A = this chain, B = another copy of it.
Amino acid sequence: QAARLRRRQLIRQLLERDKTPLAILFMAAVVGTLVGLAAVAFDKGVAWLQNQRMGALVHTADNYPLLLTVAFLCSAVLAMFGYFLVRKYAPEAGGSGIPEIEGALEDQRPVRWWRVLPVKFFGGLGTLGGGMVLGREGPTVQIGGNIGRMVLDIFRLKGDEARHTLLATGAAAGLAAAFNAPLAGILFIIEEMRPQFRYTLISIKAVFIGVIMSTIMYRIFNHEVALIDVGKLSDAPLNTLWLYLILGIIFGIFGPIFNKWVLGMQDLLHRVHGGNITKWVLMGGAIGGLCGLLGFVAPATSGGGFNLIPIATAGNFSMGMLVFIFVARVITTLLCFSSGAPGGIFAPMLALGTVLGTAFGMVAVELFPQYHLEAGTFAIAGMGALLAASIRAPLTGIILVLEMTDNYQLILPMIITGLGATLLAQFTGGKPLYSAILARTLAKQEAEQL
């Protein structure tokens, strides 16, 4: 056999490793600064909207049915202003965004930044300030993916590598500005969002440059870095690593069930309006008002969830309220994500996995006194376990939980739960969510024009 032809080119391919050009390496530092300054403005707008809501709630709080009407309408109008821009100006904007940038990294789903930027920035603000149960990473990864195409057409940058290493750098530097997690930005773009079947040139050094130039510009403005404020929990002993495997089994069984429910509620809600704009924007306003009424009364069954993760993880939640929080959050996460709204389910998945981890830990510390357990270790171990069973990005989820909760002493329970989740999500017929939505929007577009 003449097998000295492949080796003779591997000789000259191994020496030319990591040779990214300066014309890409500088535009990475440009797109990272742009997505940092965009995500900072998005966070400082969604904070100002919630401040203006909760400053007008307690201002006139004498007449309770009028106050409930105010808390309904002040969220419903901002939700209608977030559904109308999506249904009129950019139909590819409504959703998690990551199923669109994951398609854009495989040369389908064309990025039109001139109409996805002032829709996912000015309607995503309106539908996340209303208090709907969504996280601000959908309209940050999608906005960064549009900025990664904005500074490729505004600079007339030729090439085929340079599109996929800037459209991915801006996307990966949005999840590093939404969660204040630099490592999660790279380990999301090299593990889940990359083309998983073919070979593509995405320069990891440009990804690093964009991620740190977005994280610096995030930490310059958003000071007092207290995104998740769990304490230091007890280290998990080695003789009780088998409980974080049963927690992984529970999460990996629940994972494809939640994955089927999310993909079924879209097709169930797709026939209550049928595609009409004046009925879609009026159904979305009602759902955004129902997610503001539940933000005013029973304040745990709403919001991005980031305010109830420190109240969990060995906190004061009894189980009779902790199962109600889980039911009323799994009934409102897939009711305000699976309706065509700007906003991706990462934060209302972390807020679901944390509640279920606490609900398992409250049983495991009662049944097992001889282990001297702590009921908050299972919450950190199961925070990134619905993200490792429905999104099926366990290396991203474990690193993200390590980034934002700082507890390293239970890294082995984190990875045991994250690999007990993916195994029984695979063995029970479960697809990854951000690929099963991409395979749906690439089949609807296929059956539209054959």
* Chain A residues with a Cβ under 8 A of chain B: 3-4, 7-8, 10-11, 13-15, 17-20, 22, 25, 106-108, 182-183, 186-187, 190-191, 196-199, 204-205, 208-209, 211-212, 215-216, 219-220, 238, 241, 392, 394-395, 398-399, 402-403, 406, 408, 411-412, 415-416, 418-419, 422-423, 426-427, 431-432, 435-436, 438-439, 442-443, 445-446, 449
Q: A204-B395, A408-B408 are in contact. List 16 more A-B contacts (CB 8 A).
A: A10-B108, A10-B197, A14-B438, A15-B436, A17-B196, A183-B398, A183-B415, A186-B395, A190-B395, A205-B422, A205-B423, A208-B415, A208-B418, A212-B416, A212-B419, A219-B238
Q: Is the CB of A209 within 8 A of B419?
A: yes
With contacts A11-B443, A191-B204 taken as known, whether A432 is within 8 angstroms of B395 at the C-beta atoms is no
Write out the residue numbers on chain B whose beta carbons fall within 8 Å of the beta carbon of A17: 196, 392, 431-432, 435
Q: Is the CB of A7 within 8 A of B426?
A: no
Interchain Cβ contacts under 8 Å between A and B, 5 examples: A7-B442, A10-B106, A18-B432, A183-B402, A219-B412
Question: In whole angstroms, what is the CA distance A288 to B8 when docked?
Answer: 36
Write out the residue numbers on chain B whose beta carbons fall within 8 Å of the beta carbon of A426: 18-20, 205
Q: Is the CB of B216 within 8 A of A182?
A: no
Write out the residue numbers on chain B whose beta carbons fall within 8 Å of the beta carbon of A412: 182, 212, 215-216, 219
Write out the residue numbers on chain B whose beta carbons fall within 8 Å of the beta carbon of A209: 419, 423
Question: In whole angstroms, what is the CA distance A55 to B126 when docked?
Answer: 72
* Nearest CB of B to A299, in Å: 31
* Nearest CB of B to A392, in Å: 5
Write out the residue numbers on chain B whose beta carbons fall within 8 Å of the beta carbon of A205: 394, 419, 422-423, 426
Q: Is the CB of B182 within 8 A of A415?
A: yes
Write out the residue numbers on chain B whose beta carbons fall within 8 Å of the beta carbon of A108: 3, 7, 10
Question: In whole angstroms, what is the CA distance A205 to B186 when docked?
Answer: 19
Which 6 residue pairs are nearest across A and B when measured between Cβ atoms? Answer: A14-B439, A199-B199, A208-B419, A14-B435, A13-B197, A11-B439
Q: Determine the residue in chain B with the shortest Cβ distance to A436.
A: B15
Write out the residue numbers on chain B whose beta carbons fall within 8 Å of the beta carbon of A11: 439, 442-443, 446
Write out the residue numbers on chain B whose beta carbons fall within 8 Å of the beta carbon of A446: 4, 7-8, 11
Q: Determine the residue in chain B with the shortest Cβ distance to A392.
A: B18
Question: In whole angstroms, what is the CA distance A10 to B78 when docked?
Answer: 37
Write out the residue numbers on chain B whose beta carbons fall within 8 Å of the beta carbon of A14: 435-436, 438-439, 442
* Nearest CB of B to A259, in Å: 12
* Nearest CB of B to A188, in Å: 13
